[PDB]
Amino acid sequence: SLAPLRVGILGFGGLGQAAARLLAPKQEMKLVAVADRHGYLYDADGIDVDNAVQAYTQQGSVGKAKKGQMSEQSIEDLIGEGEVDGYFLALPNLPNTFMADVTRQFIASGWQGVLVDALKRTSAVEQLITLREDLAQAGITYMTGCGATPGLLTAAAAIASQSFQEIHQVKITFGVGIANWEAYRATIREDIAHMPGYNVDKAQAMTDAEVAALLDQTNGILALEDMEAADDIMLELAGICHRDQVTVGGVVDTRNPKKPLSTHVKITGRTFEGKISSHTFTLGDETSMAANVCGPAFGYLKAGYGLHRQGLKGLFTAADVMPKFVR
Amino acid sequence: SLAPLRVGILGFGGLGQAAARLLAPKQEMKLVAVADRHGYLYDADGIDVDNAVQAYTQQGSVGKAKKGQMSEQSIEDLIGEGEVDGYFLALPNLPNTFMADVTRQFIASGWQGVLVDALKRTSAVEQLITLREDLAQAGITYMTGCGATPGLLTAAAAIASQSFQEIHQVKITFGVGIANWEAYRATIREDIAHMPGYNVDKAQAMTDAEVAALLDQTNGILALEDMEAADDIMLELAGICHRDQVTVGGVVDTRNPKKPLSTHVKITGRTFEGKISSHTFTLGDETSMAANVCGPAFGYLKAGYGLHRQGLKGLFTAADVMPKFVR
Ligand SMILES: *[C@H](CCCCCC(=O)O)[C@H](C)N
Ligand SMILES: *[C@H](CCCCCC(=O)O)[C@H](C)N
Numbered sequence: 001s002l003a004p005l006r007v008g009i010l011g012f013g014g015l016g017q018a019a020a021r022l023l024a025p026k027q028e029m030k031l032v033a034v035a036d037r038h039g040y041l042y043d044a045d046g047i048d049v050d051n052a053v054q055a056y057t058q059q060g061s062v063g064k065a066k067k068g069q070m071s072e073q074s075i076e077d078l079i080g081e082g083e084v085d086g087y088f089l090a091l092p093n094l095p096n097t098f099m100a101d102v103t104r105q106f107i108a109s110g111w112q113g114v115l116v117d118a119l120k121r122t123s124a125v126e127q128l129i130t131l132r133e134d135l136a137q138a139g140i141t142y143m144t145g146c147g148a149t150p151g152l153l154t155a156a157a158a159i160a161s162q163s164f165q166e167i168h169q170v171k172i173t174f175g176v177g178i179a180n181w182e183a184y185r186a187t188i189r190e191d192i193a194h195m196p197g198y199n200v201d202k203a204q205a206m207t208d209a210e211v212a213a214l215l216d217q218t219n220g221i222l223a224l225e226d227m228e229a230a231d232d233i234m235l236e237l238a239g240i241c242h243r244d245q246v247t248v249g250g251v252v253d254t255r256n257p258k259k260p261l262s263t264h265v266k267i268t269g270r271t272f273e274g275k276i277s278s279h280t281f282t283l284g285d286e287t288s289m290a291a292n293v294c295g296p297a298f299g300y301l302k303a304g305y306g307l308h309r310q311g312l313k314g315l316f317t318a319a320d321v322m323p324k325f326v327r
Numbered sequence: 328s329l330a331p332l333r334v335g336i337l338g339f340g341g342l343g344q345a346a347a348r349l350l351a352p353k354q355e356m357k358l359v360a361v362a363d364r365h366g367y368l369y370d371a372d373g374i375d376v377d378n379a380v381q382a383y384t385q386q387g388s389v390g391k392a393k394k395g396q397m398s399e400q401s402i403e404d405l406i407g408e409g410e411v412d413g414y415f416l417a418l419p420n421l422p423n424t425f426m427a428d429v430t431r432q433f434i435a436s437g438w439q440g441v442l443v444d445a446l447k448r449t450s451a452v453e454q455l456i457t458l459r460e461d462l463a464q465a466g467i468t469y470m471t472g473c474g475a476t477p478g479l480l481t482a483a484a485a486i487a488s489q490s491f492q493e494i495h496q497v498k499i500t501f502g503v504g505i506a507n508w509e510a511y512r513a514t515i516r517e518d519i520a521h522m523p524g525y526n527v528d529k530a531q532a533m534t535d536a537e538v539a540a541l542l543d544q545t546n547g548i549l550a551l552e553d554m555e556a557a558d559d560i561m562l563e564l565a566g567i568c569h570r571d572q573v574t575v576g577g578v579v580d581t582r583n584p585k586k587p588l589s590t591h592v593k594i595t596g597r598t599f600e601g602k603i604s605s606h607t608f609t610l611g612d613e614t615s616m617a618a619n620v621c622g623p624a625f626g627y628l629k630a631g632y633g634l635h636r637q638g639l640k641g642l643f644t645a646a647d648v649m650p651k652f653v654r
Contacts, residue, residue, distance in 0.1 A: 018599075021600075024599075025599070152486065152490065155649070156487070156608065158649060158650075159479065159482045159483055159486060159649070161652050162622045162623040162626040162650050162652065163610065163611075163614045163618045163623070164618075164622065165349070238651075238652060239654060240652045271613070271615065271622075272345075272349040272351075272618060272621070272622070273615055273617070275613040275614070275618075276613065277610075277611030277614045278611045279609065279610050279611055279614070280607075281483065281487070281606070281607075281608045281609075282606065282608075283604075284490075285604070286598070286602040286603065286604035287490045287491075287598055287604045288598065288600055288602070290599075290600070291598040291599060291600060291602075294599070295489045295490045295491065295598075295599070296489040310637075310639070319649075320649060321649055322482070322485060322647060322648055322649040323485075323486065324566065325485070325488050325489065325565060325566045325567045
């Protein structure tokens with residue numbers, strides 16, 4: 001609180017903006033750094049989040065904020081300009097190697113400290129796993145899949161698993177209600193890619209005409225099933241179950257702020273007594289995606305710094321470490 | 328699996344017996360050591376659990392098992408006789424300093440490795456907190472309150488807390504159905520001590536006449552409220568909330584194996600968006616007390632060994648560390 005963790009956010013779409021708002025009341029964490037594609041903002045005294053959001057939404061980049069710098073190498077620039085202890089990578093993984101490529105930038109820069117992502121797709125977390133020794137040698141402590149799911153729900157399953165001799169199934173069912181289309185339309189193609197007959201390339205190339213066309217066919221509801229979702233490999237690496245016993249689905253209602261169903265994870269297994277049973281972890285319907293992604297993300301950044309300060313570098317998942325409550 | 332964790336159990340009432348049964352199918356953990364008040368059993372090749380339970384239930388001590396040694400200093404003897412990497416302290420805290428006194432024995436012996444308890448009462452965990460430097464200097468890694476509650480539910484609350492700016496309440500409600508009076512009547516006074524107008528001294532002095540008298544007044548139901556329960560100090564030490572915002576209650580049905588209500592923990596707080604909401608973690612009704620106490624206990628022993636192998640000694644609670652799934 002005399003010595004808060006100095007943190008940055010890379011990416012300032014809806015998620016990074018929400019992360020900035022979440023950090024505002026924190027005593028022991030201070031936002032000093034934001035970057036987007038076209039500009040960055042450093043302030044060792046703490047970001048003016050109102051000014052950064054104005055700049056981004058009104059002028060298209062935080063580079064246009066007071067103290068903002070326009071730059072086409074915004075991330076390269078920001079890394080070198082300021083004392084930052086940990087970054088939240090609130091970047092869409094677009095192209096599908098970008099998170100790994102931003103991370104390769106961090107490795108290349110000679111910067112050390114904590115990185116946290118809220119990656120979703122198994123194949124994305126697999127690219128970060130390939131970098132675990134590169135990260136370790138660099139002196140980076142990297143927390144992967146530390147959002148809502150993967151993240152919060154993955155940790156809940158890892159704890160719930162302790163009652164069982166054998167895990168049979170981990171089933172994640174999420175709900176999202178969109179309150180502000182503005183701070184979502186940037187990322188809707190990420191969700192549509194999981195729709196039947198879609199892939200990341202097909203979703204990303206869609207026009208708003210095609211998006212509105214698709215959404216009108218279901219009153220703005222995206223019912224997603226058997227998603228490529230890194231909870232599977234994270235629980236597998238944690239020794240809890242095989243990735244094939246993990247299934248992720250959910251509902252995003254693009255036309256209602258109200259969560260369309262209660263986010264939960266159900267962990268089914270057999271106990272040492274041979275009894276088959278299930279634990280369920282259910283999220284409150286008034287906890288938003290932002291709260292359930294960004295809250296854990298900074299809890300893992302804080303846990304990560306704890307690991308970093310004890311000399312433990314490399315790659316950790318949300319299934320591997322207990323997140324620390326941030327005040 | 329070529330090199331399993333060699334573990335012991337101190338105390339062989341219903342809980343220690345259940346812990347022995349839980350370890351039986353494990354590949355990467357091997358039970359080598361049991362002790363009770365009047366005898367001990369060491370076997371580096373792995374305990375015959377059938378023989379140990381026969382001896383205990385039939386002859387009143389594992390000292391009477393094959394390879395068993397009768398001894399009135401059973402714990403002092405066992406510690407010195409065998410290579411054991413971690414012990415589960417499945418001892419009733421009777422008298423109320425016994426767990427701390429057994430732990431002072433471990434500190435005095437020069438033995439190092441992992442200890443785990445399933446203590447319940449705040450004041451008991453407070454006695455272990457006083458010993459944290461003694462433990463560290465001794466080279467012991469001590470995992471306290473690593474049962475069902477405290478333990479599993481405490482870790483669930485620590486994870487659930489990450490969605491919130493401020494915690495308002497953590498409410499734990501547990502159910503226990505007693506299947507076998509035999510493996511419970513030894514510990515029923517532990518639960519009765521939490522009944523209205525009772526304390527530990529009054530409960531412990533009760534005759535079976537007085538117990539049966541009390542139980543007949545409620546068809547064998549013990550409805551317990553605002554218990555002295557270490558989940559409060561564990562979540563406080565974890566920086567999550569004040570101990571006064573933690574409340575523990577539940578129901579033990581002494582006359583039915585069926586769990587009388589679903590064990591759950593409800594975490595209420597305010598999100599960064601100012602919204603009040605609750606997460607709920609609910610246990611399966613066919614997960615027994617044994618599974619939900621002993622499963623986590625060995626998950627924390629395994630996590631503890633991981634901490635020990637990286638040179639981290641002293642005192643950890645279930646709120647502080649992610650338990651590791653034991654195969
Ligand atoms: C990513 C998943 C969001 C999880 C929402 C959980 C909740 O807040 O209850 C979306 C689908 N892009
Ligand atoms: C200790 C508490 C047991 C917790 C039971 C939880 C469950 O298995 O659902 C007892 C009251 N002695």
